[PDB]
């Protein structure tokens, strides 16, 4: 992904203000609520019946912190996203068999959560920068399908 130097600055500046304990858990949480078919991959997580139960679930918040950690790991390695996500690409593709379209949906839900948390500050050019990032993370995680 070809990110403009001004876009690399805008991203890291916004990412340093991100609540690492809540945001990721909210992304995964909303993914499971907005797109219910994703819950079949998380049968061992517990009570996922109501929206409040998904968001309040301890296993969702905990795993969500790891997903956010993987997005932070990808922001430090923008030049080599394929190698950064190579191990995770094997897990999500060869083992779990998750359709690559869902990677793109989680990325878009992350963009929605960042919008929900920052408001006006998540200006249109900042979104444009994050869309390039989440699309790059998606393609990298979908490499074992190519």
């Amino acid at each position: 992904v070809h990110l403009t130097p001004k876009e690399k600055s805008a991203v890291t500046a916004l990412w340093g203000k991100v609540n690492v304990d809540e945001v990721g858990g909210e992304a995964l949480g909303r993914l499971l609520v907005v797109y219910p078919w994703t819950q079949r991959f998380f049968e061992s997580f517990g009570d996922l019946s109501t929206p409040d139960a998904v968001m309040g679930n301890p296993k969702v918040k905990a795993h969500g912190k790891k997903v956010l950690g993987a997005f932070s790991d990808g922001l430090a390695h923008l030049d080599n996203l394929k190698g950064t996500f190579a191990t995770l690409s094997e897990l999500h593709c060869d083992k779990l068999h998750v359709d690559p379209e869902n990677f793109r949906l989680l990325g878009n839900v992350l963009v929605c959560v960042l919008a929900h948390h920052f408001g006006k500050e998540f200006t249109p050019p900042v979104q444009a920068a994050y869309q390039k990032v989440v699309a790059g993370v998606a393609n990298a995680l979908a490499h074992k399908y190519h």
Binding site: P36, W37, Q39, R40, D99, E101, N102
Partner: peptide
């Protein structure tokens, strides 16, 4: 297909 088996729309 939607509630019980939770099939992905792409399938």
């Amino acid at each position: 297909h939607a509630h019980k088996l939770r099939v992905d729309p792409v399938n």
